[PDB]
Amino acid sequence: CSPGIWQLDCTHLEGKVILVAVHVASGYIEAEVIPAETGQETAYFLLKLAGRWPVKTVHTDNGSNFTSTTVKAACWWAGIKQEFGISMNKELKKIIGQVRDQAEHLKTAVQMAVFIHNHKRYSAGERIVDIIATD
């Protein structure tokens, strides 16, 4: 797809919420554990994501994720539109299970699993910077 397209979804694990952003063209992932599955957490996460990468459009598998006033406000300010042109969430949950006993906190296992996914082979982390630099 286009180099500005990202997909955001939440998954549940251990009674906690993991927000997962996937750069669609590359397979590169950012993820965080958030306390509540709310618009404000999504909005804040979008602000962080857009200061780091050139985010043009965002997609989701649960469209009601984006009806927040706060989400719309974050997308407005960062100049993000909704992607209309369109499972690495399962692989990530798989890597988390593989490392989970290595960490006390779930959020630590998540970041270990993001690390492994992005540097596993080129890797998704190498592909994203090549795609963005070329563009």
Ligand X SMILES: CC(C)(C)O[C@H](C(=O)O)c1c(-c2ccc3c(c2)CCCO3)nc(-c2ccccc2)c2ccccc12
24 near 6, Cβ under 8 Å? yes
Phi-psi region of 92 (alpha: psi -120 to 50; beta: other; left: phi over 0): alpha
Q: In this chain, which of 11, 119, 120, 121 binds a copy of itself, going by CB under 8 A?
A: 119
* 12 sits near ligand X (criterion: CB under 6 A): no
Partner in contact with 104, chosen from ligand X, a copy of itself, none, beta carbon below 5 to 8 Å by kind: ligand X
Nearer to a copy of itself, 13 or 131 (CB): 131
Taking the C-alpha atoms of residue 14 and residue 113, their distance in angstroms, rounded to an integer, is 16
The beta strand positions in the chain, using DSSP E, are 5-13, 16-23, 29-34, 57-59, 81-82
Bridge partners of 33?
18
Site string for ligand X, 42-81 (x = CB under 6 A): -xx--x---------------------xx--xx--x----
Contacts with a copy of itself by CB under 8 A lie at 30, 32, 44, 47-48, 50-54, 77-78, 107-108, 111-112, 114-115, 118-119, 125, 129-130, 132-134
